[PDB]
UniProtKB/Swiss-Prot annotation, chains A, B:
This is Putative zinc metalloprotease PA3649. It comes from the Bacteria. It comes from Pseudomonas aeruginosa (strain ATCC 15692 / DSM 22644 / CIP 104116 / JCM 14847 / LMG 12228 / 1C / PRS 101 / PAO1). Residues 2-71 form the PDZ domain. Belongs to the peptidase M50B family. It is found in: Cell inner membrane.
Length: 92, 92
């Protein structure tokens, strides 16, 4: 259960465009508390093109972040994409 | 029908905290196109405490904005509040 703390960002992805930063902790997605990183991955992958709203903890302050998920892959593999990852080898 | 173009902001309100700015045009709320300012007023007033996601046009660029609506009033008058208004005398 990996903590949902951002360690990488795609410079051309939705997450950076939305104002997310390395070190941010994702607290909720569309009002649903985030348990771990896999929950984010699963939710993002299922939602190509969708608006999503986040509660984010940054340096002790809670902020609201909005983004529109992009799309990667084709056919069965076509998925939502946020352009953010956690430590290790972990990408959403 | 008043265009949903921000002309005033409460410095302690959710809108300024969310990164909204004077001159911003509200294009959608929670995925629903904004027709006019009264639609914003009506939607905000109905949603005390609620997360809302906006599409916003700022100087030709569309961005995604998230906020949590605050609360004002008491009893029957208790309503959601965003802390933004349009030109004239108009506030949401």
């Amino acid at each position: 259960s990996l903590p949902p703390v951002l360690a990488e960002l795609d410079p051309k992805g939705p997450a950076q465009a939305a104002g997310l930063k390395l070190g941010d902790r994702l607290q909720s997605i569309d009002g649903i508390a985030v348990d771990d990183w896999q929950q984010v991955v699963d939710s993002v992958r299922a939602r190509p093109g969708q608006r999503v709203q986040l509660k984010v903890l940054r340096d002790g302050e809670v902020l609201d972040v909005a983004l529109e998920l992009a799309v990667r892959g084709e056919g069965k593999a076509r998925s939502g994409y946020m352009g953010a990852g956690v430590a290790g080898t972990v990408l959403a």
